[PDB]
Amino acid sequence: SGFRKMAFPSGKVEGCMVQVTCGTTTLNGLWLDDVVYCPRHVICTSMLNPNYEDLLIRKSNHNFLVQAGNVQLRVIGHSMQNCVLKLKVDTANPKTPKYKFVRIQPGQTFSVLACYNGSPSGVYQCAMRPNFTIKGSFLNGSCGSVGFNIDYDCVSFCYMHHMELPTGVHAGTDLEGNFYGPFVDRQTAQAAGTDTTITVNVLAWLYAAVINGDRWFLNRFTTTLNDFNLVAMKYNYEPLTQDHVDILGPLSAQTGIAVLDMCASLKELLQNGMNGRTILGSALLEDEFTPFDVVRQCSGVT
Amino acid sequence: SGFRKMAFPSGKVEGCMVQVTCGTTTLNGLWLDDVVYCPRHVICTSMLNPNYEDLLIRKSNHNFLVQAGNVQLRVIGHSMQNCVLKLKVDTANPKTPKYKFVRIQPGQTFSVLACYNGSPSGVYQCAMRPNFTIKGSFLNGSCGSVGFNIDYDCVSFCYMHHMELPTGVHAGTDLEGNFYGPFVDRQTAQAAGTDTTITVNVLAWLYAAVINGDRWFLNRFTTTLNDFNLVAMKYNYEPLTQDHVDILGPLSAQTGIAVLDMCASLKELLQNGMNGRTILGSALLEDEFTPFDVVRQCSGVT
Ligand SMILES: *C(=O)c1ccc2[nH]ccc2c1
Ligand SMILES: *C(=O)c1ccc2[nH]ccc2c1
Numbered sequence A, B: 001s002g003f004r005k006m007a008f009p010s011g012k013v014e015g016c017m018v019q020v021t022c023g024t025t026t027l028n029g030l031w032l033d034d035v036v037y038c039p040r041h042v043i044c045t046s047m048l049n050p051n052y053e054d055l056l057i058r059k060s061n062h063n064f065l066v067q068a069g070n071v072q073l074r075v076i077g078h079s080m081q082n083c084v085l086k087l088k089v090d091t092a093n094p095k096t097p098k099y100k101f102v103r104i105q106p107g108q109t110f111s112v113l114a115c116y117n118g119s120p121s122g123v124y125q126c127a128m129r130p131n132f133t134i135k136g137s138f139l140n141g142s143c144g145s146v147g148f149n150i151d152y153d154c155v156s157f158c159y160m161h162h163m164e165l166p167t168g169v170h171a172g173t174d175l176e177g178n179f180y181g182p183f184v185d186r187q188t189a190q191a192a193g194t195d196t197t198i199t200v201n202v203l204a205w206l207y208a209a210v211i212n213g214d215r216w217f218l219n220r221f222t223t224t225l226n227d228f229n230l231v232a233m234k235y236n237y238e239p240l241t242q243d244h245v246d247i248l249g250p251l252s253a254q255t256g257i258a259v260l261d262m263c264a265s266l267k268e269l270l271q272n273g274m275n276g277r278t279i280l281g282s283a284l285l286e287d288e289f290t291p292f293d294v295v296r297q298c299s300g301v302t
Helices: A052-057 A201-211 A225-234 A242-246 A249-255 A258-274 A292-295 B052-057 B199-213 B225-234 B241-247 B250-255 B261-274 B291-297
Strands: A017-022 A025-032 A037-038 A066-067 A072-075 A075-081 A086-088 A098-101 A109-116 A119-127 A148-152 A156-166 A169-171 B017-022 B024-034 B035-039 B066-069 B071-073 B075-081 B085-089 B097-099 B109-116 B119-129 B146-153 B154-164 B170-173
Touching: A017 A037, A025 A066, A025 B024, A037 A156, A037 B199, A052 A075, A066 A075, A066 A086, A098 B146, A098 B241, A109 A156, A156 B199, A169 B071, A201 A242, A201 A249, A201 A258, A201 A292, A225 B097, A242 A249, A249 A292, B017 B035, B017 B119, B035 B154, B066 B075, B109 B154, B146 B225, B199 B241, B199 B250, B199 B261, B199 B291, B241 B250, B250 B261
Parallel strands: A098 A156, B097 B154
Antiparallel strands: A017 A025, A017 A066, A025 A037, A037 A086, A066 A072, A075 A086, A109 A119, A109 A148, A148 A156, A156 A169, B017 B024, B017 B066, B024 B035, B035 B085, B066 B071, B075 B085, B109 B119, B109 B146, B146 B154, B154 B170
């Protein structure tokens, strides 16, 4: 029993975190096999409209100081891939896990290993919001921290941290260096666009709550998908699709509550609020747990 | 910016997790140097009033199967220490970190590495509640999962998981095998006692919110410690002491808001509610972040 924001164990990623320094800029890099990946912003200096192709042509291998704990790694090649740099080093990381570089969808979750000066500091769960930002926790020095999921000892890296936007939310790239969302690694007035609530995730979390014994929000009503989606639009929730209904199939069967029956509960919660009650220790409707997250953590017993 | 429930990186603990099997019971153990620590419940069978001294006298070393990944560890000694067992093995764990066994106080937080069959599954933050339970997330097979904090590469182990109580909350021991709270490792009608809210933690989290730009709950008023404590009693909050005020000193100085000024905000929130607003993404007053947790995660800039 219980339900927590639960990250994947971070050990496989900790053994890949290094420090990259170019001039007076220090940030984090990811060392896999004989390559270190880091944000190309490490080659910036005193910001408005940098030409990174020029900045990189002017660098030499010896300009990049890479430190893995107390060992310096000799850089033997450098190249740019979109908004990341690839620093080839003379030593393969003996701790490299099985890994993949995946790009995630908005509404999916991942674990973040926040690092500073190449040293891991903390681990937490994040979701990619519909507007392609993440609500992270990052301070100065966090550039190059990574996001990931783990499946049967394979690490799927999905996020490298770059910047903080004016509202305090965060933006970054996949490990191919392509930004999530309409953001750029330079100084502009860019801001997060309007966001929405991830409906399928809210429904998954109501299922988690039922599995854990919170039932007060259930009711005898069932709604249609079309009628529910009319309510979702009013409250800035994303539309629910039949694929979403299908994905919720296992949790629906385990609790015996049809997906469209739970939707009638969600409509009532949106229209009435909670009237002073809580669900899984929260007084708001939580949207940062996917159906997979609920299945991973919650009992399987039907 | 940002504020998340952030665990310590779990790698140093993952390398210590093993599987202990005695008969048809399997659970987790912690392998440090040449000793494996696990709940003594592993020697139970088909529960009401076990005499563990008798159960252990009837065991031999060969009855305990210890597996570290795909390597079996040969047990060469066994002994009981309160509610844990100490299984001496013929091999020191080459991955043992610097460590200490500490016992924590109610109101303090730690990270939990949830494990199953000796394999780590997830990591999350927990607080020891005033009634000595934890609100964890654990399924069958989780016995022997551990709680810990990390400080300059030293792991302070503070919790080993034993059981789930009827309300779904959890109880366990320190690594000396002494239970937190009035609980026992046998079948009884034991239940969690009445709980309270951890006032100093709520104040720390309001400071986190100020540091992160949420200011709507601030006001021009200051209260006395005695008058605040009258309000705390009414709302089932713990009393605030001068030591608590002192501990909040650094956060008070960083934000420029005196502790007793913030207390006037907390009184108003308790008496009026939030009127539809949120603080750090929550619609309730959060009490599972200590002042140390806030300092660890939040900007230091005054
Ligand atoms: C770190 O990767 C970083 C710092 C500041 C920035 N501004 C635009 C992109 C970045 C990246
Ligand atoms: C596991 O350590 C465990 C399972 C069930 C129990 N009942 C009382 C104590 C325990 C411990």
